[PDB]
Write a protein that binds this DNA or RNA. Structure first.
Ligand SMILES: [Mg+2]
Length: 580
DNA sequence: GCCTGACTCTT
DNA sequence: AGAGTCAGGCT
């Protein structure tokens, strides 16, 4: 049952064909500066396993890796590329990435190893990585014969599966999406991760000192007001103090017991002085543990940088996610929190952070796809979209829009951009399900084109089995036909939301590719550091700011041509915080 | 150790 | 929705 291969102790020319499946195995979850445990090559001449100390010290092998005209098929090529970048080796000529191919074919499969991709085409001659490496504490690299066979089987699966994946992509009109968008983006992301983002650890540490002291003050005040010490961070213990000792009313239960969420506690504040102090404690503790301690833990002491990993094959919308650290949820809303962004600084002296963000990209996409005359007109006039929505829903003039009217309109706009239920909108606005339904109804009378689009997109999802984005990304929605109402409704909302959010993701990904090309053409030293859904963050010499002010917004604005303009705001400063 | 549930940040 | 932290109950 053992697949034939050559366990090479030296590199030979027949290993360096100009078309090959390549496995460069990094087993550590976080691949930054991580070991490469083994290498496998499959090509028309046979199957080969190479030890990394052998292969990666071979000038011919390394040149082969770096020759763009020697084509390679891989799985998760960014992992390999980055691990190699840390060893000073460049990987080029990756013409097919099976991870990204499987992701585009069906993002809900959750394909995370070669075995899971292979299964989609009834190929099972490869083991899941979890079966070979083990799980958790038991995770280990096996002995060489077991390792070697695994890597060769992965490589053989890649070799076999390229053709059928490419054929289905083509049938779906997704072949360009793979080859011209996701794969090129993967190289750009690899560069971004490798560059990293410099952190002023001293400033974070001082902030942590300050928080630590404010926490101790509040924590003591909590115990005074409770008349005893307890674990504030245990919703169980807190529940007993609040709802039993202090007899506060129970406005919401959870599966386990009593809810202690911020929104419940906010309704309880008038009853007892402990509640505000709990909320304050939760806010500070969140900052301290998730953003000060959580960032400090993942700063590389060697670089003084954080090197995130972007997961390009996770979301069902096509958005990127970010880990270790997650840089897509750094506080912005509250000033105390926002100050965390002061710790993200340029990696060189006399460089600055430059940030550019799309203004209402999701609603502008909606205008374009729905062709709603009112929404299209609003963006053609570059109106404040929330004020304009308030004017229409409440049928008032601009100077009759009150702050609460605007807040409520904005909540409706948010519910559209994120596909939330009427229940969700109700929770968000602290109103009844019924009143939420009336708001939504008023919206559709002002934007009948959006209503029509919603109805049409759901019918299309029902007919075809899936919805698509501008750039041909697909999401299958088998629950759209369910008889469970909550199940069906969620799927209908995903039918509505996905073309919106997915198309925005498509646009920014194209912008990133276009921007990388232009930065090179223009000979700038500016580099992309991060993407945060609708914004791009770069660092550059201070001497490049004026050029980037013109360059970056134009590249982002012209990424696609919609029925409405795209608009990009930008800022720069000495820290990410100041780039506001 | 491993797993789940509660909670919270941004988008 | 996605990532992360903490507790608490599992083995
Ligand atoms: Mg924005």
């Amino acid at each position: 049952a053992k697949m034939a291969f050559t366990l090479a102790d030296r590199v030979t020319e027949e290993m360096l064909a100009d078309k090959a499946a390549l496995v460069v195995e990094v087993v550590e979850e976080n691949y930054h500066d991580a070991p490469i445990v083994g290498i496998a090559v499959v090509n028309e001449h046979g199957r080969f396993f190479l030890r990394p100390e052998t292969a990666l010290a071979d000038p011919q092998f390394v040149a082969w890796l770096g020759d763009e005209t020697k084509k390679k098929s891989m799985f998760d090529s960014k992992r390999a590329a980055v691990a190699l970048k840390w060893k000073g080796i460049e990987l080029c000529g990756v013409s097919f990435d099976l991870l990204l191919a499987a992701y585009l074919l069906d993002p809900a499969q959750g394909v995370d190893d070669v075995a899971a991709a292979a299964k989609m085409k009834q190929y099972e001659a490869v083991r899941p990585d979890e079966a070979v490496y083990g799980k958790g504490a038991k995770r280990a690299v096996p002995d060489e014969p077991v390792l070697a066979e695994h890597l060769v089987r992965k490589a053989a699966a890649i070799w076999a599966l390229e053709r059928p994946f490419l054929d289905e992509l083509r049938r779906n009109e997704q072949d360009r999406l793979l080859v011209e968008l996701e794969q090129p983006l993967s190289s750009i992301l690899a560069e971004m991760e490798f560059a990293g983002v410099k952190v002023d650890t001293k400033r974070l540490e001082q902030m942590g000192e300050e928080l630590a002291e404010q926490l101790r003050t509040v924590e003591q005040r909590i115990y005074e007001l409770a008349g005893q010490e307890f674990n504030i961070n245990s919703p169980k213990q807190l529940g007993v103090i609040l709802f039993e000792k202090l007899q506060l009313p129970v406005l919401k239960k959870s599966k386990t017991g009593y809810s202690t969420s911020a929104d419940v506690l906010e309704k309880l504040a008038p009853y007892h002085e402990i509640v505000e102090n709990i909320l304050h404690y939760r806010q500070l503790g969140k900052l301290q543990s998730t953003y000060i301690e959580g960032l400090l833990k993942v700063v590389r002491p060697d670089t003084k940088k954080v090197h995130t990993i972007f997961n390009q094959a996770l979301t069902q919308t096509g958005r990127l996610s970010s880990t270790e650290p997650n840089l897509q949820n750094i506080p912005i809303r509250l000033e105390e929190g926002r100050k965390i962004r002061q710790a993200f600084v340029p990696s060189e002296s006399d460089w600055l952070i430059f940030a550019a963000d799309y203004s209402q990209i999701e609603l502008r996409v909606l205008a374009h796809i729905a062709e709603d005359d009112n929404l299209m007109e609003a963006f053609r006039r570059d109106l404040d979209i929330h004020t304009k929505t308030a004017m229409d829903i409440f049928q008032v003039s601009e100077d009759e829009v009150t702050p609460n009217m605007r807040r409520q309109a904005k909540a409706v706009n948010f519910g559209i951009v994120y596909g939330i239920s009427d229940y969700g909108l109700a929770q968000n606005l602290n109103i009844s399900r019924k009143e939420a339904a009336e708001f939504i109804e008023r919206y559709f009378e002002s934007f009948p084109g959006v209503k029509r689009y919603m109805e049409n997109i759901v019918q299309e999802a029902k007919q075809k089995g899936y919805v698509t984005t501008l750039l041909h990304r697909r999401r299958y929605l088998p629950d759209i036909t369910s008889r469970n109402f909550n199940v069906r409704s969620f799927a209908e909302r995903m039918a509505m939301n996905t073309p919106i959010q997915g198309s925005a993701a498509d646009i920014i990904k194209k912008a990133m590719i276009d921007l990388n090309a232009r930065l090179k053409e223009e000979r700038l030293q500016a580099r992309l550091l991060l993407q945060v859904h609708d914004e791009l963050i770069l660092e550059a010499p201070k001497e490049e700011m004026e050029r980037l002010c013109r360059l970056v917004p134009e590249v982002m604005e012209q990424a696609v041509t919609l029925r409405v303009p795209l608009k990009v705001d930008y800022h720069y400063g000495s820290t990410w915080y100041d780039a506001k």
